[PDB]
Amino acid sequence: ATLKPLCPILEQMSRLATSIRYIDHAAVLLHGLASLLGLVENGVILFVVGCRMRQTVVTTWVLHLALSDLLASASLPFFTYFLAVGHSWELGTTFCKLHSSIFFLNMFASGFLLSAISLDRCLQVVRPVWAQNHRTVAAAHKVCLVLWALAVLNTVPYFVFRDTISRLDGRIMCYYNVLLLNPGPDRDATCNSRQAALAVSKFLLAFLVPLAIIASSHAAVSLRLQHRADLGLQHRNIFEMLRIDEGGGSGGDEAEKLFNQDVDAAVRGILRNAKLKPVYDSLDAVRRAALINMVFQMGETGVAGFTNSLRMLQQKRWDEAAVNLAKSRWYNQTPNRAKRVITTFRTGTWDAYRRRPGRFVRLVAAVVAAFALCWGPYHVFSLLEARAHANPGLRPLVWRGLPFVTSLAFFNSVANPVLYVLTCPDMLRKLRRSLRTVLESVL
Ligand SMILES: CN([C@@H]1CCc2c(c3ccccc3n2CC(=O)O)C1)S(=O)(=O)c1ccc(F)cc1
Ligand SMILES: CCCCCCCC/C=C\CCCCCCCC(=O)O
Ligand SMILES: CCCCCCCC/C=C\CCCCCCCC(=O)O
């Protein structure tokens, strides 16, 4: 036989005269239905958004946001089995680590994605010139891959410090064991230090900091839109295009700004090139603005690569240039930012990017609301559990609330897909269409 040293928080939990267990069937059914609903709801969401819906940047955020919830409701039926046998983990040690990791993986992922969403909207409003030339779908996909890697990285310690602990009544707990690996000379000290180190860091990186970014990005937008509304109602600013001085301040540090919008710098480069300058002189003010965007999107070298297209613009053969530009890799990989430039060359009319209002606003505000209401109460008790190492009086209070608010965060994965439909008419329409098509196939 063996013997492991445990933290005082655990030892009391390991001591609460019979092998017979009482089964709360109500919780079994409650978590049972939540498993099926959670899998089916997020299941059809991924299909509707990903297969039968036009792919943009915002729908990419939601797509990954529905993927983490799918994994979250995949671990749920194993937790139902846990309750079915009277609160006991009977599926080995390695499966205990993996099952627990999913909960934390979904936690960090959801907190990072809600941050990315708020920042994507912020860049769209605060820096219009940059956004229209770089906010592509492929970039949105690339960002998510980084976020998941950081999500996995932050769930590494929780995988390590999970362990199965035998009780005195026969049950087997699956919970924290901060002494499992590399315990210091002082067990009591390292029990408290690394426990608070987990509760505090998880509270900041995955909740408080997301909420801070969300609220901070929300205030920047509302003020920027108010200023823009005042500019639009001015007679002078009627046909103005590619503005920068909306944020105020001087215009001397334009070459040093992140998410750059230095329009003047590109113009000097255009005149420096022997290929682009005579073409630039041929075009009118509107078609010059579209040429600058091309320089912004692929650089001077790439724009000078379209020989036949430049020759067509210089002779004012617009429709002929439009046909040529449409058969390129530039238009094939990023159609949205490309179609806007090509059409400008055709019509000779400018289409304002800052005219287009944001989408999925009702969706994000609803998911955030559910996010703060489900993970809110959880972190409150989690921080108290770390505090309960020095104060013994808080311990019975933790044993009551923590099992509930944990299941509350669990049910967050079941709430979101319902909220997706109620705040997005396009989603609901596309769903009833698929539903009707499916039912018609049988008849
Ligand atoms: C009910 N059991 C755990 C409660 C807390 C908890 C569990 C769990 C499983 C996966 C992911 C997270 C989980 N949490 C919350 C957390 O890890 O912070 C099961 S229990 O009987 O072992 C238990 C009951 C009361 C308690 F205070 C601690 C553990
Ligand atoms: C296993 C059961 C659940 C399966 C439901 C349907 C799965 C298919 C979902 C969409 C697949 C194609 C997605 C294409 C968009 C890629 C966007 C991205 O992930 O960056
Ligand atoms: C499965 C149980 C989990 C449910 C947790 C609660 C989820 C819903 C949270 C609050 C949603 C409120 C939405 C706020 C926007 C209201 C829409 C409006 O009036 O414009």
Curated annotation (Swiss-Prot):
What does the record say about domains?
The 330-DSEL-333 motif is involved in the recycling of PTGDR2 to the cell surface after agonist-induced internalization. This motif seems to be required for GRK2 and GPRK5/GRK5 to promote agonist-induced internalization.
A single Gene Ontology CC term: neuron projection
* Protein name according to UniProt: Prostaglandin D2 receptor 2
What species does this protein belong to? Homo sapiens (Human)
User: Keyword set for this entry?
Assistant: Cell membrane, Disulfide bond, G-protein coupled receptor, Glycoprotein, Membrane, Phosphoprotein, Receptor, Transducer, Transmembrane, Transmembrane helix
Gene coding for it: PTGDR2
Q: Where are the transmembrane segments?
A: 26-48, 60-81, 99-119, 139-160, 203-223, 364-385, 405-424
Q: Please indicate which part of the intact protein appears here, giving the first and last residue numbers and the full length.
A: 5 to 327 of 395
Q: Does the keyword Repressor apply?
A: no
What membrane topology does this protein have?
Multi-pass membrane protein
